[PDB]
Each structure stands twice: as C-alpha cells, then as structure tokens.
Amino acid sequence: AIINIDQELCTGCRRCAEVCPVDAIEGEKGKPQKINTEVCVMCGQCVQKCSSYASYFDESITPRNVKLQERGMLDSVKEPLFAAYNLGYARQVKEALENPQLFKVVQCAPAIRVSIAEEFGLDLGDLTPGKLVAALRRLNFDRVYDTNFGADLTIIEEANELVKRIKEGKDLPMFTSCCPAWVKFAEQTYPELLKHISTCKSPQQMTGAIIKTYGAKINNVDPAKIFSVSVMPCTCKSYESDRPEMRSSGYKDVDLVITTRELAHLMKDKGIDFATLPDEEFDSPLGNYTGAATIFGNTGGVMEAALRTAYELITKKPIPNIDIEFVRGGEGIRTATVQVGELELKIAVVSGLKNVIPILEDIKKNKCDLHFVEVMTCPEGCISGGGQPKLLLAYKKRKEALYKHDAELELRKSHENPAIKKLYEEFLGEPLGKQSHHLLHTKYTPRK
Amino acid sequence: TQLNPFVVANPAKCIGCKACEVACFAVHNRNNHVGATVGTVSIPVIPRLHLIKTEHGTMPIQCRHCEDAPCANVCTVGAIKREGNAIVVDEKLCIGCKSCLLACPFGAIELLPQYEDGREVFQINLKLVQEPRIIAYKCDLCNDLGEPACVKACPENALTLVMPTEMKKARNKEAALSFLRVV
Amino acid sequence: TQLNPFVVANPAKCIGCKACEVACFAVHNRNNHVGATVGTVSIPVIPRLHLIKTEHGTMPIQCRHCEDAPCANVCTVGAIKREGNAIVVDEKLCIGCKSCLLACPFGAIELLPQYEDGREVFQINLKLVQEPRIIAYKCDLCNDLGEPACVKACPENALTLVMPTEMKKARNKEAALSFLRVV
Amino acid sequence: PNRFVIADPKRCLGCYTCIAACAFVHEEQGLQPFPRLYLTYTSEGIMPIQCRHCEDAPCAEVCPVEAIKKEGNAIIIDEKACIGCKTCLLACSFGAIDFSVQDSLEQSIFKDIKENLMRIVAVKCDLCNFREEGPACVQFCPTKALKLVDGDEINKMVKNKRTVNVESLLSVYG
Ligand code: 402
Ligand code: SF4
Numbered sequence: 004a005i006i007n008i009d010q011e012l013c014t015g016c017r018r019c020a021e022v023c024p025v026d027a028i029e030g031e032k033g034k035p036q037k038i039n040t041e042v043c044v045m046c047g048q049c050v051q052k053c054s055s056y057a058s059y060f061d062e063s064i065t066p067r068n069v070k071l072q073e074r075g076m077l078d079s080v081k082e083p084l085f086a087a088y089n090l091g092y093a094r095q096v097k098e099a100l101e102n103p104q105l106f107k108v109v110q111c112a113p114a115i116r117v118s119i120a121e122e123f124g125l126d127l128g129d130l131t132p133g134k135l136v137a138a139l140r141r142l143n144f145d146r147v148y149d150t151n152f153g154a155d156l157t158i159i160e161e162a163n164e165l166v167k168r169i170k171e172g173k174d175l176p177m178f179t180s181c182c183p184a185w186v187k188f189a190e191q192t193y194p195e196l197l198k199h200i201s202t203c204k205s206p207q208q209m210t211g212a213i214i215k216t217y218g219a220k221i222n223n224v225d226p227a228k229i230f231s232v233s234v235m236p237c238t239c240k241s242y243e244s245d246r247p248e249m250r251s252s253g254y255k256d257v258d259l260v261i262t263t264r265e266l267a268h269l270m271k272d273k274g275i276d277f278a279t280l281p282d283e284e285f286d287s288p289l290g291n292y293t294g295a296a297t298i299f300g301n302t303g304g305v306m307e308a309a310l311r312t313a314y315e316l317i318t319k320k321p322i323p324n325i326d327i328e329f330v331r332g333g334e335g336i337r338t339a340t341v342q343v344g345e346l347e348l349k350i351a352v353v354s355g356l357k358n359v360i361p362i363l364e365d366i367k368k369n370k371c372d373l374h375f376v377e378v379m380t381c382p383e384g385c386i387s388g389g390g391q392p393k394l395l396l397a398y399k400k401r402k403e404a405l406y407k408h409d410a411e412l413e414l415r416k417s418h419e420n421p422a423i424k425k426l427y428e429e430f431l432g433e434p435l436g437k438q439s440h441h442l443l444h445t446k447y448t449p450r451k
Numbered sequence: 452t453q454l455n456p457f458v459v460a461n462p463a464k465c466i467g468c469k470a471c472e473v474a475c476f477a478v479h480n481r482n483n484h485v486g487a488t489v490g491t492v493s494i495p496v497i498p499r500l501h502l503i504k505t506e507h508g509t510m511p512i513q514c515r516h517c518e519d520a521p522c523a524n525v526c527t528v529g530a531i532k533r534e535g536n537a538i539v540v541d542e543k544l545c546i547g548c549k550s551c552l553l554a555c556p557f558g559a560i561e562l563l564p565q566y567e568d569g570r571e572v573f574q575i576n577l578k579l580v581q582e583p584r585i586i587a588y589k590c591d592l593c594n595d596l597g598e599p600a601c602v603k604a605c606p607e608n609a610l611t612l613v614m615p616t617e618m619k620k621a622r623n624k625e626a627a628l629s630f631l632r633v634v
Numbered sequence: 635t636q637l638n639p640f641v642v643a644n645p646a647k648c649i650g651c652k653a654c655e656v657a658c659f660a661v662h663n664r665n666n667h668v669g670a671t672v673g674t675v676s677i678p679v680i681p682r683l684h685l686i687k688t689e690h691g692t693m694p695i696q697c698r699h700c701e702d703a704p705c706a707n708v709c710t711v712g713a714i715k716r717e718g719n720a721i722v723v724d725e726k727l728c729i730g731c732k733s734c735l736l737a738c739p740f741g742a743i744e745l746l747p748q749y750e751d752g753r754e755v756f757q758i759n760l761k762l763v764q765e766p767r768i769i770a771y772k773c774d775l776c777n778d779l780g781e782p783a784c785v786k787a788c789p790e791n792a793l794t795l796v797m798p799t800e801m802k803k804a805r806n807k808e809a810a811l812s813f814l815r816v817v
Numbered sequence: 818p819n820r821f822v823i824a825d826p827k828r829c830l831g832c833y834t835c836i837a838a839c840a841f842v843h844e845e846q847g848l849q850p851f852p853r854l855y856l857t858y859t860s861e862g863i864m865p866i867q868c869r870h871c872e873d874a875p876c877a878e879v880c881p882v883e884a885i886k887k888e889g890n891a892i893i894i895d896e897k898a899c900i901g902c903k904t905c906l907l908a909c910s911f912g913a914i915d916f917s918v919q920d921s922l923e924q925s926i927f928k929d930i931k932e933n934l935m936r937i938v939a940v941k942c943d944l945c946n947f948r949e950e951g952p953a954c955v956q957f958c959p960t961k962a963l964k965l966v967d968g969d970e971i972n973k974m975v976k977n978k979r980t981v982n983v984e985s986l987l988s989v990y991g
C-alpha cells in the first residue's frame with residue numbers, strides 16, 4: 004500500500020483515470036474508486052489530478068487526527084488532505100535525525116533547487132542552491148551531497164556501454180534505466196525485452212553505492228552506522244530503494260526516500276524561514292559536478308549529457324556540440340539524427356509511458372532500429388513527478404531555470420570533473436573493469 | 452437599476468470533482484498567504500458554493516442574488532447590503548445572529564470561523580479559553596476581483612454566468628421561430 | 635432511411651363497432667394490471683385512434699406520422715421524437731403546453747391525465763387539493779410491442795397498415811399494365 | 818383545462834396597443850405597471866408572446882416559497898409572497914416571465930409614454946381574472962389578432978378539423 008485512494012473522500016470523478024499510463028484503477032462513473040496495486044506502475048501522477056478535499060468541519064468522517072497517522076505525514080502540517088494520497092516517510096526521517104549516534108548523509112536531486120522555492124511563497128521556478136544547502140546543513144545533517152555526481156557517473160557508464168555495444172551489435176535499440184517506473188512496466192508487460200534495457204543504475208543508486216563503500220574511507224567512520232537519505236522529486240524511487248537486487252556491501256545503498264513536499268514539511272516543522280537563509284556550498288569530496296548533470300530534470304537532458312561525451316569517445320577530437328535544439332520538446336515522440344564517426348545515429352526520446360508502446364513493438368523497431376531511446380514515465384521528465392507540489396488545478400519555469408543553471412556553469416562536457424578523475428584513479432581503475440560491474444550495474448531478471 | 456447576474460450549474464455536465472470550490476477558496480484568500488500551491492495553505496479550507504449529490508446526479512448550489520433578498524431584510528445589524536450589482540455580506544459588522552439561516556430557502560450561507568493573516572481570529576471577552584469569531588460565508592460573485600473563478604476552473608464547462616435579460620430574449624425568439632414556421 | 639408506415643381505415647367496410655379502440659387501450663395499459671378481462675380494469679378508458687361518423691359513413695382516424703411533423707416542431711421541450719420507424723410521444727418530458735393541439739390538422743393528439751400502476755398520477759406542487767398531471771396521447775404504431783393491435787381486432791379488416799413506397803410501385807405497375815393493354 | 822390566449826402573426830401590425838393596455842390596466846388596478854405580453858421580432862414575422870398556461874406549469878415545481886399556484890383556470894403568481902429568486906426564469910420554455918425592473922423595457926413608443934407620464938418582483942400574465950370584462954389584450958387590439966381559447970373551444974376546433982378531414986377523404990377517394 005503505497006499509492007492509495009481514500010474511500011471516504013473519493014466521489015468517482017474519473018479524472019485520475021485519464022492520465023494513468025497503466026489503467027490500474029477500477030470503478031464506475033460513480034462510487035469510490037480503488038487502485039489495483041498488483042499492476043500499478045507507481046508513476047505518482049494520479050495524485051496531482053485529485054481535488055476532493057473533504058474538510059474537517061463535519062464529524063461524518065475521521066477527525067483529521069488519525070488521518071495524518073495513516074498517511075505517515077507529520078503531526079504539525081495542517082495542509083488540506085486529498086483523496087489519492089501518497090504514503091509518508093517523514094516520521095522515520097525525523098526519528099533517525101533525533102538520534103545523535105548515526106552519521107547522517109543526505110542527497111539532493113537536480114530538481115529540488117527549482118521546486119522547493121514555491122513552497123514558501125516565492126516566484127515559480129527560482130534557483131536557490133545556496134539557501135537549500137544552508138537549510139539542509141541547518142537540519143542537523145552531517146553530510147550533504149548532490150546526486151549529480153552519480154548523474155555524471157552514469158553518463159560516463161552509458162556512453163562507454165554505447166561505444167561497447169555499437170561494436171558487435173547485440174540488442175542495439177537499448178533503453179536506459181533512469182526511470183524505475185519504466186523498468187517496472189517492462190517487468191509488467193514485456194518480460195521478453197528485459198535484456199534490451201541498459202544495465203546502468205540510477206544516479207541515486209550510484210551515489211548510494213559510492214557512499215557506503217568509498218565514502219567510508221574518505222572519512223574515519225565505519226560503513227555500518229552511516230544513514231543515507233535521498234530527496235527525490237518523485238514517488239518513483241521508494242520501490243527502487245528496497246529491491247533485494249539493489250544493494251552492495253551487504254547494506255542498503257539508500258535507506259529511505261522523501262519527496263519534495265516532505266522536505267518542505269520538515270522545514271516548516273523545524274520553524275526556519277527560507278528567505279533569511281544565507282548561501283552556502285556543498286561538500287567538495289562528493290558534491291562537485293558539471294553542467295551536463297544538471298539537466299536530468301527536464302526531458303532530453305540525459306540524452307544530451309550522454310551525447311556530449313559519446314561524441315568525444317567516438318571521434319577523439321573536440322567538436323562544439325554544447326547547444327542542440329532538435330531534441331527539445333514537451334509532448335509526443337522526439338527524434339533526431341546525428342552523423343558522428345562515419346556512423347549515423349537515429350536517436351529518440353519518449354514523453355510519457357503510453358507513447359513508447361508503438362515504437363517498442365518488435366516489428367516497429369525493425370525499420371529504423373532506434374539506436375538510442377530513453378524513457379520518462381511522467382511527462383516532461385521528472386520535474387512533473389509525484390514529488391512536486393500541486394498547482395491548485397507552469398511547468399516551463401522550472402525547466403527554464405534548470406537550463407539557465409546549465410548555461411551559467413563553466414564546465415559543459417561531463418568529463419572535466421576532477422572528482423571523477425580522482426575516483427577513477429583511486430577506486431575503480433578503468434570503467435567496466437570488474438569493479439564497476441559489481442557496484443555500478445544490476446541485472447533485471449524478475450521475468451514474472 | 453437592472454437585473455443582477457448569478458451563476459448557475461448544469462446537472463447534465465457535472466461529475467462531482469470538487470475542482471470548482473478549490474479555485475474559489477484560493478482566489479478569495481490571497482491575504483492569507485496562498486501561492487497557488489498546496490503547502491502554502493496554512494488555514495482550513497472554506498468554499499462559497501456547495502456541491503450536493505443525490506439519486507438524480509450531483510450539482511453545486513450557491514447564492515442566486517435575489518433582488519428582494521430575505522437575507523438582507525432580516526439582518527438587523529445591517530451586514531448584508533447590495534453594495535455592487537451583486538449582494539455581498541460584510542465581515543466587519545456581522546455578529547452571527549443566525550436569522551440568515553432561517554431566511555434563505557436555498558441555504559447558500561454558512562457560518563464558519565474567520566481566518567485573517569493566516570491565523571484564527573479570536574474575540575475579546577468569551578469562554579477558560581478564548582472562542583473564535585464566526586462569520587457568514589456566501590458567494591459575492593467575485594465583485595472585488597475579476598471574472599468568476601468557479602467558471603474557468605470547471606473542466607467539463609458546466610457552470611455558466613447567466614444574465615436573466617438576454618436569456619429571456621433568446622427563449623422568446625426560439626419560441627417565436629418555432630411557432631411561426633408552422634402556421 | 636425509410637418512410638414511416640401509417641395505419642389507415644377503409645370506410646366502405648367499417649361498421650363503427652368500436653372494437654378497435656378497446657384492443658388498443660388494452661394493449662397499451664399492460665402496466666395498469668389488465669388481464670384481457672373486464673373487471674380487472676380500474677382505469678378510465680383512453681384509446682389512441684378516434685372514431686367519428688358523418689352522413690356518408692363512419693370511420694376512425696389516427697396519427698398519419700408526417701415526415702415534416704408540425705407537432706414535433708411546435709413543441710419547445712422536445713417530447714415528441716421519432717424513436718423508431720414511427721413517430722412517438724414521450725410521457726416524461728411533456729409539460730402540458732397545448733400548442734401541439736394547435737398544430738396537428740388531423741387532430742390525433744388528446745391531452746388527458748396520465749395513469750400508471752393502476753392509480754392516477756398527481757403533480758407535486760399545485761392547488762386545497764392536488765392537481766393531476768396531463769400528458770398527450772396519440773398513436774405510436776405499437777413500436778415497443780408487437781404488431782399493431784388495431785389490425786387483427788377489426789372483424790371486417792377495414793384497418794390496413796400501408797407502406798407508402800411499395801404501394802406506389804404497385805400503382806405504377808397497374809397503371810402501366812392498363813395503358814399497355816390498350817395501345 | 819386551462820384558458821389561455823393565442824395570437825396568429827397574420828394580423829399583428831406591432832402597433833404596441835395591447836402591450837400598453839395590459840400595462841395600464843394592471844397599473845390602475847393596483848398591481849405592477851409592467852406589461853406581461855412581449856413583442857418579439859424575428860427573421861420571418863412578428864408575434865406577441867405571453868404565458869400559454871401550462872397544465873403542469875414547470876413553474877410551481879421550482880418556486881421555493883410556493884408563490885405560483887393554480888387558481889380558477891389559470892396560473893397565478895401571487896406577487897405578495899414572491900422573493901425574486903430567478904428560478905422560474907430558468908424553467909420557462911417560452912420565456913413568459915420578466916421581472917419588474919425599469920431596464921427591462923425596450924426602447925419603443927410605450928417607453929416614451931411611460932416616461933412622459935411620470936419593489937422588484939416577477940410578473941406573469943394572470944389572464945385579467947379580476948376584471949368582469951375579458952382580457953384587455955384581446956379587447957383593445959385594432960385588428961383582433963389575439964383570441965382567447967377556452968376548454969371547450971379546443972374541443973370544437975378538434976372536432977371541426979377531424980370532421981372536415983373525414984368528409985374530404987370520403988368524398989374524394991376512399
Ligand atoms: N535517479 C534518478 Fe534521476 C536523477 O538525478 C531523479 O532523481 Fe529523476 C528527477 N528529478 C527522478 O525521479 S530519474 C530519471 N532521469 C532524470 S532525473
Ligand atoms: S500511481 Fe500512476 S499508475 Fe498507479 S494508479 Fe496512480 S496514475 Fe495509475
């Protein structure tokens with residue numbers, strides 16, 4: 004029970020059945036609905052199109068005090084409660100934070116810097132990294148890191164995988180595993196294509212594997228009392244963080260995840276304002292990143308970052324490819340062709356999960372061969388996931404802020420990070436060198 | 452002096468999504484720190500139109516803005532006045548004398564606590580704790596702000612702002628064309 | 635699309651025995667607890683076709699099911715519709731505006747109280763007694779039920795159901811055969 | 818059933834006499850001075866429109882105060898108890914109800930007369946039941962366009978049309 008619909012508030016308005024990419028909700032034009040939790044793909048977008056908000060001025064329902072216990076939210080938020088509710092993880096994070104024994108480390112996703120500022124009565128899509136890191140340090144967090152380290156790591160891994168696979172072509176139309184909902188859907192309906200999906204882990208799991216093994220040696224702490232919490236803008240990472248095949252060194256790479264709304268609730272409970280907070284910086288050993296890792300929030304950013312280094316790995320000499328405009332969009336299926344290394348690439352990206360089913364078919368993929376296709380279950384990338392707050396019913400402001408943050412940095416190619424060079428020199432050696440295959444990869448074999 | 456408009460529902464194209472009340476609550480409470488985002492709402496929610504569901508479907512009901520309004524006449528203090536084209540309650544002078552709830556036959560007025568600057572508003576001398584001030588809430592047809600917000604937020608486009616003068620002319624012309632084509 | 639059939643009477647063989655109205659009344663009031671036996675009828679009798687007599691013979695007349703029906707055009711509510719091959723009246727949207735009586739030149743529509751479940755229907759708010767509800771009555775060609783009941787109840791077979799397309803073909807063939815046998 | 822009044826558009830000049838008579842009779846009686854018979858201009862013909870007295874009303878079923886009621890053989894508004902809830906204006910198909918407001922008058926000769934001469938409530942044709950004479954609209958018309966139809970005139974017209982149809986069908990071809 005993660006994505007549930009309360010039956011004392013739902014009026015059967017059926018508006019949440021028009022955006023579900025699986026049709027996991029069963030009901031009628033009237034009467035309360037119900038979620039088929041055995042087929043649900045956990046996209047989280049049936050939450051932001053719900054508007055039954057039944058108030059507590061009547062005693063015909065629960066008294067709005069036990070409801071916050073069931074939802075798992077904090078007891079001092081007093082926000083309106085809807086019907087299709089996400090499960091809460093704030094109480095466990097607060098209780099773990101109150102413990103002064105566990106070394107605490109938190110991870111920031113590349114959409115928290117543009118979404119949380121709307122929770123405190125500011126402009127829509129305001130880039131405040133320094134205020135965010137200052138608040139996270141003021142939350143009694145011992146270490147704060149950016150998951151963009153794992154983003155650059157998985158870009159390098161995906162580029163190396165593409166260069167390896169283009170030679171001796173074997174499952175050439177591969178897909179990326181950045182979106183756990185897509186992997187869940189592939190397990191659901193197409194078990195015969197579990198080998199097409201690339202074996203790269205998500206950047207969150209990249210940083211989770213790095214912290215528990217490499218991060219224990221950069222400091223003087225044993226890798227057993229470390230407590231890792233990741234702030235991801237999606238209801239999509241909770242299922243990825245507790246799979247039995249998604250751990251290394253015996254311990255979970257990340258303990259539990261919280262959406263942006265939960266972090267805002269924690270900040271409100273701590274009673275600290277946001278405008279007064281000064282500007283700070285992240286921890287240098289595991290928080291340095293380049294511009295290419297910043298645009299994972301918007302669609303087409305993963306493909307752009309992968310291309311920015313695959314081009315160099317293919318032609319071995321620099322050609323300016325920082326700016327690309329044929330892979331930008333917000334709806335439908337986007338495609339482009341790139342001529343590099345005397346080879347043509349018919350690259351494409353898909354917005355939504357229902358849109359990829361046409362070109363996923365084994366006969367439709369046999370005409371263009373679809374050299375590189377990534378996936379985002381929520382439309383317009385992760386910036387419209389279940390973690391982002393409601394808008395009381397836009398999306399362009401956050402992606403424009405992310406693009407401006409990308410353009411304002413002095414590093415564009417996802418290889419100039421000194422942290423990556425140091426990590427390769429000290430810990431991993433070479434990519435895909437029997438050490439990356441243990442920590443940086445996983446095998447998708449449910450076959451259910 | 453001319454007829455006042457009033458919003459009316461449409462039971463054929465209403466579902467019961469409650470997405471028209473939230474827009475009203477968000478547009479009226481701009482002084483209680485709302486930023487069109489759930490999470491900045493630190494106050495309980497109070498709409499103006501009320502959705503009612505029965506065997507023959509569901510629809511919202513609200514104030515019809517009567518001309519010889521019973522609610523305005525029974526109010527001894529003088530809170531309810533026809534300030535603009537529509538009929539509006541005044542929050543400064545209301546004392547909660549519940550005669551309004553015995554006047555309006557539709558029931559578009561509800562007594563709820565006031566919330567100003569994001570906090571509950573208390574009284575001077577009552578009970579030993581304090582007690583909140585109770586005000587009458589009803590539709591004011593968004594006279595202070597722009598066009599109505601319950602419309603432009605209905606996904607099915609069911610709510611309509613009807614002026615009772617043009618509708619009569621349209622119905623008259625329809626009847627005249629229907630009868631004159633047969634004789 | 636196909637032209638609506640309409641039942642017609644042959645006056646040279648009709649007697650006026652009024653055995654055709656009774657069958658229609660019995661066949662349309664199965665929901666009023668009639669068991670094809672006089673004595674179970676607790677409802678006043680209302681037929682659909684109406685019999686009249688003049689100096690030159692007796693016959694009944696009924697709805698001719700006009701294609702460009704004036705009765706459908708006059709009604710502003712829209713109760714009269716062409717549900718099937720025939721044109722029918724709806725007893726749920728009728729309001730009693732007698733203008734449909736001023737449209738039909740054949741006078742096949744009569745405004746009479748509605749009877750359901752063996753008892754007279756009563757309107758909700760009228761005057762201190764309750765006024766009955768009045769609905770239009772006309773021939774609907776028994777589309778919901780089986781074959782027309784006015785036919786198969788006339789002893790002289792004066793009532794005939796005609797198709798206004800095949801009959802024209804028969805007339806054309808007879809005229810051609812009559813003309814060609816002389817030339 | 819109920820008695821009402823109908824105006825065939827063949828002999829209506831739009832001379833505004835019936836409208837003014839209906840207004841002024843109700844004014845001198847002591848009721849609202851506004852007319853209850855509306856002249857409408859169309860693409861093909863001009864016909865006055867009034868309250869065809871519906872036998873189920875669609876009016877008394879929406880009034881919350883129960884002001885509209887059937888009296889004698891007509892539908893009576895009972896203005897004293899009416900409050901102004903514009904609900905019967907939604908449920909009238911022909912649009913036979915207007916409200917007693919100065920702006921409800923269209924610009925015409927009648928407006929000039931009423932402005933050179935000198936409560937808001939719903940007014941409807943009450944068929945002039947308070948007057949020993951017939952309706953004022955049918956009586957003051959220069960061309961006698963309007964006519965009052967009873968419960969028996971409908972039956973007479975129906976029987977006449979039915980007999981004419983039967984006799985014609987008999988005489989011409991069986
Ligand atoms: N892991 C991971 Fe990703 C990163 O970094 C997030 O956290 Fe995304 C976001 N925002 C989510 O959910 S997943 C898909 N790739 C684009 S972004
Ligand atoms: S979370 Fe997504 S897949 Fe699951 S029921 Fe909601 S909309 Fe459907």
Ligand code: SF4
Pocket residue numbers: 008012013014015016017018019020036052053054055086087468
């Ligand atoms: S949107 Fe909310 S209220 Fe409407 S059917 Fe879905 S869960 Fe129920």
Ligand code: SF4
Pocket residue numbers: 045046181182183184185236237238239240379380381384385387388389
């Ligand atoms: S797009 Fe991001 S938030 Fe949405 S399902 Fe995929 S990983 Fe989760």
Ligand code: SF4
Pocket residue numbers: 525526527528529530531540544545546547548549550551587
């Ligand atoms: S409750 Fe307020 S508005 Fe109503 S009558 Fe009393 S003072 Fe007037």
Ligand code: SF4
Pocket residue numbers: 513514515516517520521522523538554555556557558559560589
């Ligand atoms: S509150 Fe009721 S009585 Fe007062 S104007 Fe509105 S609908 Fe009429």
Ligand code: SF4
Pocket residue numbers: 458474475499500513590591592593599600601602
């Ligand atoms: S018209 Fe305006 S004030 Fe009235 S219910 Fe609609 S949104 Fe609210």
Ligand code: SF4
Pocket residue numbers: 460464465466467468469470471472502511604605606607608609610
């Ligand atoms: S928004 Fe429209 S459809 Fe939804 S409850 Fe309101 S009136 Fe009905």
Ligand code: SF4
Pocket residue numbers: 708709710711712713714723727728729730731732733734735770
């Ligand atoms: S009486 Fe019934 S059928 Fe005749 S016009 Fe009125 S609504 Fe239509």
Ligand code: SF4
Pocket residue numbers: 696697698699700703704705706721737738739740741742743772
């Ligand atoms: S009721 Fe009269 S006018 Fe209407 S279709 Fe039948 S015969 Fe023609």
Ligand code: SF4
Pocket residue numbers: 641657658682683696772773774775776782783784785
């Ligand atoms: S066809 Fe049916 S409805 Fe018409 S007169 Fe005959 S029995 Fe009555």
Ligand code: SF4
Pocket residue numbers: 643647648649650651652653654655685693694787788789790791792793
């Ligand atoms: S049953 Fe036949 S013979 Fe008897 S009255 Fe009717 S049409 Fe004439």
Ligand code: SF4
Pocket residue numbers: 824828829830831832833834835836865957958959960961962963
């Ligand atoms: S009195 Fe007669 S002619 Fe003059 S406007 Fe009235 S209906 Fe027309």
Ligand code: SF4
Pocket residue numbers: 879880881882883884885894898899900901902903904905906939
């Ligand atoms: S306006 Fe008068 S007649 Fe019409 S519904 Fe309201 S009270 Fe009844």
Ligand code: SF4
Pocket residue numbers: 867868869870871874875876892908909910911912913914941
């Ligand atoms: S006002 Fe209109 S709906 Fe009501 S009885 Fe008169 S004509 Fe019929």
Ligand code: SF4
Pocket residue numbers: 822838839840853854867941942943944945952953954955
């Ligand atoms: S009957 Fe009397 S009240 Fe009705 S329209 Fe004619 S003059 Fe006016």
